[PDB]
Write an enzyme that holds these catalytic residues in place. Structure first.
Site, PDB file in Angstrom:
ATOM      1  CE1 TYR A   1      55.733  52.805  20.038  1.00 27.08           C
ATOM      2  CE2 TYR A   1      54.446  52.869  18.290  1.00 27.08           C
ATOM      3  CZ  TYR A   1      54.826  53.495  19.217  1.00 27.08           C
ATOM      4  OH  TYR A   1      54.935  54.910  19.567  1.00 27.08           O
TER       5      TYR A   1
ATOM      6  CG  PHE B   1      42.170  66.273  42.999  1.00 27.28           C
ATOM      7  CD1 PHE B   1      42.830  66.165  44.126  1.00 27.28           C
ATOM      8  CD2 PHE B   1      43.145  65.625  41.813  1.00 27.28           C
ATOM      9  CE1 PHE B   1      44.034  65.983  44.396  1.00 27.28           C
ATOM     10  CE2 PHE B   1      44.575  65.501  42.261  1.00 27.28           C
ATOM     11  CZ  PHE B   1      45.037  65.372  43.367  1.00 27.28           C
ATOM     12  CB  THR B   2      44.864  70.351  42.242  1.00 29.58           C
ATOM     13  OG1 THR B   2      45.693  68.954  42.218  1.00 29.58           O
ATOM     14  CG2 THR B   2      44.943  70.696  43.774  1.00 29.58           C
TER      15      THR B   2
ATOM     16  CG  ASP C   1      39.463  60.378  40.160  1.00 28.46           C
ATOM     17  OD1 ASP C   1      40.426  59.468  40.351  1.00 28.46           O
ATOM     18  OD2 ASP C   1      39.876  61.451  39.972  1.00 28.46           O
TER      19      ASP C   1
ATOM     20  CE  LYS D   1      47.273  59.161  43.009  1.00 31.00           C
ATOM     21  NZ  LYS D   1      47.893  59.926  41.991  1.00 31.00           N
TER      22      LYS D   1
ATOM     23  NE  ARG E   1      47.122  68.636  48.898  1.00 31.72           N
ATOM     24  CZ  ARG E   1      46.861  68.570  47.412  1.00 31.72           C
ATOM     25  NH1 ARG E   1      46.252  67.480  46.881  1.00 31.72           N
ATOM     26  NH2 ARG E   1      47.707  69.398  46.797  1.00 31.72           N
TER      27      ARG E   1
ATOM     28  CG  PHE F   1      49.763  72.411  44.764  1.00 29.68           C
ATOM     29  CD1 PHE F   1      48.447  72.903  43.774  1.00 29.68           C
ATOM     30  CD2 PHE F   1      49.973  71.101  44.657  1.00 29.68           C
ATOM     31  CE1 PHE F   1      47.985  72.203  42.945  1.00 29.68           C
ATOM     32  CE2 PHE F   1      49.755  70.238  43.708  1.00 29.68           C
ATOM     33  CZ  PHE F   1      48.545  70.681  42.893  1.00 29.68           C
TER      34      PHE F   1
HETATM   35  C1  LIG Z   1      41.858  61.417  43.294  1.00 30.83           C
HETATM   36  C2  LIG Z   1      42.983  62.057  42.274  1.00 30.83           C
HETATM   37  C3  LIG Z   1      44.423  62.375  42.726  1.00 30.83           C
HETATM   38  O1  LIG Z   1      44.789  62.512  44.028  1.00 30.83           O
HETATM   39  C4  LIG Z   1      45.289  62.693  41.840  1.00 30.83           C
HETATM   40  C5  LIG Z   1      46.681  62.727  42.242  1.00 30.83           C
HETATM   41  N1  LIG Z   1      46.925  63.134  43.746  1.00 30.83           N
HETATM   42  C6  LIG Z   1      48.078  63.076  44.302  1.00 30.83           C
HETATM   43  C7  LIG Z   1      49.169  62.677  43.788  1.00 30.83           C
HETATM   44  C8  LIG Z   1      47.897  63.143  45.767  1.00 30.83           C
HETATM   45  O2  LIG Z   1      48.996  63.464  46.229  1.00 30.83           O
HETATM   46  O3  LIG Z   1      46.798  63.184  46.086  1.00 30.83           O
HETATM   47  C9  LIG Z   1      44.959  62.368  40.315  1.00 30.83           C
HETATM   48  C10 LIG Z   1      45.779  62.705  39.297  1.00 30.83           C
HETATM   49  O4  LIG Z   1      46.501  61.435  39.288  1.00 30.83           O
HETATM   50  P1  LIG Z   1      47.861  61.518  38.650  1.00 30.83           P
HETATM   51  O5  LIG Z   1      48.939  62.122  39.867  1.00 30.83           O
HETATM   52  O6  LIG Z   1      48.299  62.388  37.606  1.00 30.83           O
HETATM   53  O7  LIG Z   1      48.504  59.806  38.463  1.00 30.83           O
HETATM   54  C11 LIG Z   1      43.589  62.079  40.099  1.00 30.83           C
HETATM   55  N2  LIG Z   1      42.828  61.694  40.787  1.00 30.83           N
HETATM   56  C1  LIG Z   2      59.388  58.608  17.567  1.00 30.52           C
HETATM   57  C2  LIG Z   2      59.780  59.999  17.341  1.00 30.52           C
HETATM   58  C3  LIG Z   2      59.040  60.934  18.053  1.00 30.52           C
HETATM   59  C4  LIG Z   2      58.260  60.889  19.308  1.00 30.52           C
HETATM   60  O1  LIG Z   2      58.736  60.209  20.371  1.00 30.52           O
HETATM   61  P1  LIG Z   2      57.871  59.417  21.260  1.00 30.52           P
HETATM   62  O2  LIG Z   2      58.725  59.122  22.332  1.00 30.52           O
HETATM   63  O3  LIG Z   2      57.411  58.288  20.303  1.00 30.52           O
HETATM   64  O4  LIG Z   2      56.587  60.173  21.681  1.00 30.52           O
HETATM   65  C5  LIG Z   2      59.767  62.457  17.947  1.00 30.52           C
HETATM   66  N1  LIG Z   2      60.408  62.563  16.839  1.00 30.52           N
HETATM   67  C6  LIG Z   2      61.171  61.608  16.292  1.00 30.52           C
HETATM   68  C7  LIG Z   2      61.989  61.977  14.807  1.00 30.52           C
HETATM   69  C8  LIG Z   2      60.695  60.237  16.157  1.00 30.52           C
HETATM   70  O5  LIG Z   2      61.111  59.158  15.577  1.00 30.52           O
END
Ligand SMILES: CC1=C(O)/C(=C\N=C(/C)C(=O)O)C(COP(=O)(O)O)=CN1
Ligand SMILES: *Cc1c(COP(=O)(O)O)cnc(C)c1O
Ligand SMILES: CC1=C(O)/C(=C\N=C(/C)C(=O)O)C(COP(=O)(O)O)=CN1
Ligand SMILES: *Cc1c(COP(=O)(O)O)cnc(C)c1O
Ligand SMILES: [K+]
Ligand SMILES: [K+]
Ligand SMILES: [K+]
Ligand SMILES: [K+]
EC number: 4.1.99.2
Lengths: 455, 455, 455, 455
Positions: D70, D122-123, D213, D256, D380, D447
């Site tokens: 942990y 970005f979205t 980013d 990525k 897109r 989307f």
């Molecule tokens: C430049 C940029 C992206 O393109 C992005 C997610 N984009 C996707 C998944 C894509 O298909 O382009 C994200 C969000 O990342 P995440 O999909 O939450 O790990 C941040 N920055």
């Molecule tokens: C650990 C715990 C959570 C939280 O779950 P995580 O996966 O740690 O975010 C919620 N409720 C109880 C009772 C827990 O023990």
């Protein structure tokens, strides 16, 4: 006394038990030979410690880096240098497991008519000696054949017997001395460093070669550290390196003390023997650069051999076996003493004194243990000893035993209690165990697939 | 009394066996805060049962079959049908772990000013309720707050408190009842099926929704099978399915009872809410069909949740924790009673009654335990309670405890002996345990990085 | 023309991209012998298609489910029913790889002085036949020995040679017909179904047994589907099953067409032989139910053999090799024709016609190819042929070739371009390629460790 | 030009195509939204390069060494030092993926009423900015919105526009500058080092913070090495380190360019921001010491980020995309130019000039491509751009594109040919593509799960 596991559990596999009458069915379907039961019909599997070990997270990381090239694999280079470093031998030839290396050694080092002398026989070893034209001579001391006799280093060669062999036969008619550590069939009994050094001095003076069976050398080193005076402060690795400094080479089933599920090798110091070994390895195993192993397996075995040198690991390994033995002994169950490195051996002569050795008490007891407990164990008695290749009669080993063999890093003390509790209950009605007779007997290594019926 | 492990070891995890003197140095380098110890320096890590579970061979096989598609992964559909079958909820949205599912629920289901009532509370769960504008009301039975009271089903909701909340605030002003199984803050105490049904019926008559915090629902089901009459003939799975039939949905940390290292999910029966949840999951977690998990992890969680239904597995999981509690208690070591599903809580106030709470007896006991045994445990006392930043005073909790938290399938009874024997030995000269003082204290999350020295 | 890969990449293997100048140094440190190169220094390794295959995600999942029991492993039963279903043989004995199965067959099936006849031969196969006392007789069609002759089913046995052997020696003096699919030494040439049936019928009328060397039976089945009329509507699996219905059993290197890194097996229909084979397998390999393989490897081989039945997979495997041959040939590079299932053989005699065979044109061309492209290929010419140790003269083979051997599922068409483009560029100034001379030559296995320098 | 893969294939996963009419069924079942198709009904999956990468043998070796503790996990320490070393930032907070870090940054660094300015929206980024009370301002130069305009470094910020923003709004009302590398929605367009340095100088003088980013920073570094004068002899790693020396921190979707299937992080230099980030991370993700990731995933991402620095790897990655682009362009298919780092973007305005942007040409074309080819691609365009949170009208991006997004290390040039051949045929009858209209529209990030019907 009894240390806790010096590791955590990384992953598990389920175990279950089927009802007694299912087991009854299964035991007769298998011709009362435990070797012929199916893995999934076994609750705790103590048939053997060979190839049944749990690997570590590091070994499994090595398994992902399998360099599968036919020659020049990184995995072969890592195995080669680990074994050179740890065992001290000049050359290594990988083989897929132990009897692959025995096949090579016996073909390389035996001229027909010659004698091989060892500290007690082993099944595959003696078969490979004899099929290449050698007579096996047992030079372990007498005490090693006395099951209940509790003495240290029972695996030691009797120097008087080796001297006798040399005078009677002549040194040039002795192919080599085969020195196993530990000695499996005596109950996993260790050999002392003093004994290895005396054997070396005596053989060297007559020009006789010595090859070790290294299969359980780490268990053996543990016994030296624990019990041989002057070794209490040496590391397991130092002790292993010194052991092999007294040998001309070794065979190794890595499936035991290298902590793997497959693998072995042959080592030697002599260049000309190394040349000849490479010629032969290509016939039976593979190129000298993989020896019938995947790269990932050479990697796992290099990593596992080094892990085996950790004091806390091997101490726990051996004391867990000793715990099962202590429990059985405190309850009056007859066993081979002292307890060896890898298994507890029930003494079947005593467990079933109402049978003769000709009624296969050991083979019978192993079947009974399965039927009453779902625990699988192995015959290590008259059936395993095979037939005398001159008379056709059974070899008659004094040691008529049933082996509860412990895989490395797989079970817990609570599993040992379950096993002990079951054996103890079977003991209460030992008179219930019946004689067996062959209904099918293989022409060699008959214990593997022999089938029986109750007399 | 205590069953053997219903599994065997497939692979091991490597740990350090550093001796006491070296452990003292690591403890000192960590400023006597176990939260600052390096994992590589710890023999037995009982910091938490969250995400530290050992997976099976079958789970590891699913880890090789991760369909890593951004949408429509086969692993999501396996997870989805598994949870529908076993929990009997209509809809499921995966989340990366529990608090991701709690984030979604609280945003979906709470209007500002509304109440959420539950059987005690957990920090993340209660946080998400409050930041969406809810007021928390504890409706657990009063017995749950008497930490030495040895009674069954201590996690049960007091129906009269629920009725009283309804009469005083109105049903329309209650967002939902949050019913947790087991109840963590009471020490892992279970909730009975009768209680779950009584709550379903009262809430349903008033139109009030009930959502479960299902994190340790399988441990809870084991207690119902073992202790609630009428459930002797039911399977763990039948019990789990019946539990959830009394809820409108749930949040789940798979990192606990689904036997995985990462993963969780949100369930509900209501179509409109399922639609809104899919609109929100993409904001914080990912698609309705991965929810911030790799495909391999939805697969491992689908496989793990189904393994958790095996009677022998959860029986052994709960009795292994119980074994540790029984052993401590038989030697007079003060613990929270009765022992819960997942941990044992030492009463450090009573253990270190020569120290005042301002001398951090739980933090100090946790440090001592590591030094003496290589075991890491968690402070759950004045330090974790934090400091009032307005007034500068400690929050002073009634429970001053050390949590011995047991990951699933990682440890054996011998590891539990290492822990018990070490704590028992400290108990015998408990007066020698020294108080701690801050030498570094951050403004927030002080339990995570604070350093101390002996007074 | 050439299909896209019918799979995508799940994981990659890391390789070195060292530049030409550094490659020249590695080549020199290896004494210009590609067999002495380190795997870590090679970009594309076409040394061999044996055991260098890429496994699937499903195979890797089976790798996590190895039941490592010494006997009765679930993985053996999976392997067993898979081969029974797909090859349609009654009995199967696993072996660690092909030559282990050949060892068993030749011991079981040959009496000293008897003949074994086959369509050409392979080194290990023929070795085991001869050391058990057999005389080899080549009964392949004469066309198979014309390496530039572009005709179909070049691997076919000449029925008239078989008849002639029978008339001259007697049926009782022929141990068996060894029919290989494909035929390696002719360059991987297939055998037609009509031929297999004609041979079954002639041998059966005389009581003679036929055993297949099934190592590349799936490549062979692809050629029959593609080119033998009447098989257009048959699945690869239907074709494979029909092929084996014309045999009494087989030996198999799974390291080729079962898509694994290690593994093989022996099949037969005869009960008595199956019994004898189980008596012998324990001598060299292991139990009838692991045969010198880890449980995970029987699992990977059971899964791999079934994947190999997919039409699109084997079509692409064979056409990828064909793509390399077509490209070389379109630029005038001399190759063995037609291109076989698993490799392309460059004709180094013609490629380096300014050099004499005593200047080792194939060894030298192989070294050049590595220096120019990072590709390792195998010498299959005068060097591998070895030296007559009686007379001290080279064995002088008619084929002086470099083998470009293609592992299954490891490389893409762009890697095939790297290989082709590099060889094509060397071809354009082929006169600059230098002869080699020995600077170190061992007595045996000279191709494995010999070192050279430029003349 | 077009290099071969600088790696070998270690393992594969099967791909197949279902008939056109099955695909027809599936496209309507999915409401004509490619996001709603199932993974197993897709032949080549180019929806996204996020989380769909093939890992290496080394990363998978890291996966076996998951330290699941942990706090204090070896995996967290390895990730932390790799990112400190390679990116140069003082502090790191792991998150389960990119939008987890965006959630943290936006809550930490935005006061309501303030502006965030970026090189194109970005979205998920814009959604997290806006829900925390920020107005998004686009300061990318105009040319970046002209699809067909082929100029280098299209991702560059317009300094004139940033200066204007500062004069008009006042520096203290600007939360921070968001600089993405590459710029995804402009077609994966790079930012020059000169531009990053000018942006830093100008923002620093006004006390304004800059957060990158980092999601495709390695692709971006490749473009700098290839095309920016004075960088041709710098290593990718040197270039990456210099890029980040101009930022105050970054968000990263490791899914990525860190070559993994899950994972991300937030970096910063400021101590007080690091403190606050750790407080928040516990609410949404996990403890600062794992951030919602399994240990094995922190390990894979540490290993993958370093692998990404290898020149030959990133050169091939980018040129493979360029090959698909070159093929489409040689045939007259309209695309965004020049081709970006991770995907080819079909220009849907030109592909379907008979539709208006209000008839969702991009969403429609993606559905059509699936129906005709089984290849999945992503909208897109207007659908992704969302609604103006002030007027309720669609944002109307000039870039109305369909993305063929290439996962790293997964496909070959032959797969690129298949994709190109299919798109080219659809082009021949582009007039066949129909307008779409919403039947279901989510309230944000629409989307992802929007459903449509043909107009
Ligand atoms: C430049 C940029 C992206 O393109 C992005 C997610 N984009 C996707 C998944 C894509 O298909 O382009 C994200 C969000 O990342 P995440 O999909 O939450 O790990 C941040 N920055
Ligand atoms: C650990 C715990 C959570 C939280 O779950 P995580 O996966 O740690 O975010 C919620 N409720 C109880 C009772 C827990 O023990
Ligand atoms: C001492 C020794 C052995 O015990 C041995 C095999 N013994 C087994 C498998 C046993 O169950 O004892 C072998 C043969 O190894 P092998 O099983 O072929 O890897 C050699 N030496
Ligand atoms: C490689 C090969 C063999 C030998 O198999 P191994 O698994 O290498 O022992 C036998 N026959 C043929 C035709 C081969 O190519
Ligand atoms: K095994
Ligand atoms: K974890
Ligand atoms: K191999
Ligand atoms: K993924």
């Amino acid at each position: 006394n009894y240390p806790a596991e010096p590791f955590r559990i990384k992953s598990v596999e389920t175990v279950s038990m089927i009802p007694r009458d299912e087991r009854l069915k299964k035991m007769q379907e298998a011709g009362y030979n435990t070797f012929l039961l199916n893995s999934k019909d076994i609750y705790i599997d103590l048939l053997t410690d060979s190839g049944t070990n749990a690997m570590s997270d590091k070994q499994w990381a090595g398994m992902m880096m399998g360099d599968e090239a036919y020659a020049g694999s990184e995995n072969f280079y890592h195995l080669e240098r680990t074994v050179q470093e740890l065992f001290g031998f000049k050359h290594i030839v990988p083989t897929h497991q132990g009897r692959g290396a025995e096949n090579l050694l016996s073909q390389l080092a035996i001229k027909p008519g010659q004698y091989v002398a060892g500290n007690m026989y082993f099944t595959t070893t003696r078969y490979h000696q004899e099929k290449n034209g050698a007579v096996f001579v047992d030079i372990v001391r007498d005490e090693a054949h006395d099951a209940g006799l509790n003495i240290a280093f029972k695996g030691d060669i009797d120097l008087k017997k080796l001297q006798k062999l040399i005078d009677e036969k002549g040194a040039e008619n002795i192919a080599y001395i085969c020195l196993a550590v530990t000695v499996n069939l005596a109950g996993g009994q260790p050999v002392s460093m003093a004994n290895m050094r005396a054997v070396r001095e005596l053989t060297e003076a007559h020009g006789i070669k010595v090859f070790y069976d290294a299969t359980r050398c780490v268990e053996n080193a543990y016994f030296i550290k624990e019990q041989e005076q002057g070794f209490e402060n040496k590391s397991i690795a130092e002790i292993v390196h010194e052991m092999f400094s007294y040998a001309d080479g070794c065979t190794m089933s890595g499936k035991k003390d290298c902590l793997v599920n497959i693998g072995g090798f042959l080592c030697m110091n002599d260049d000309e023997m190394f040349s000849s070994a490479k010629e032969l390895v290509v016939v039976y195993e593979g190129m000298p650069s993989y020896g019938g192993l995947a790269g990932r397996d050479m990697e796992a075995m290099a990593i596992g051999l080094r892990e085996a040198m950790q004091y806390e690991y091997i101490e726990h390994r051996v004391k867990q076996v000793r715990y099962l033995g202590d429990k059985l002994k405190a309850a009056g169950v007859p066993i081979v003493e002292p307890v060896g490195g890898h298994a507890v051996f029930l003494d079947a002569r005593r467990f079933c004194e109402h049978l003769t050795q000709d009624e296969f008490p050991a083979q019978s007891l192993a079947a009974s243990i399965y039927v009453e407990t779902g625990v699988r164990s192995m015959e290590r008695g008259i059936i395993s000893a095979g037939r005398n290749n001159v008379t056709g009669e059974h070899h008659r080993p004094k040691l008529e035993t049933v082996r509860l063999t412990i895989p490395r890093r797989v079970y817990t003390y609570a599993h040992m209690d379950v096993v002990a509790d079951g054996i103890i209950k079977l003991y209460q009605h030992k008179e219930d165990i019946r004689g067996l007779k062959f209904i099918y007997e293989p022409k060699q290594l008959r214990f593997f697939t022999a089938r029986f019926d109750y007399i």
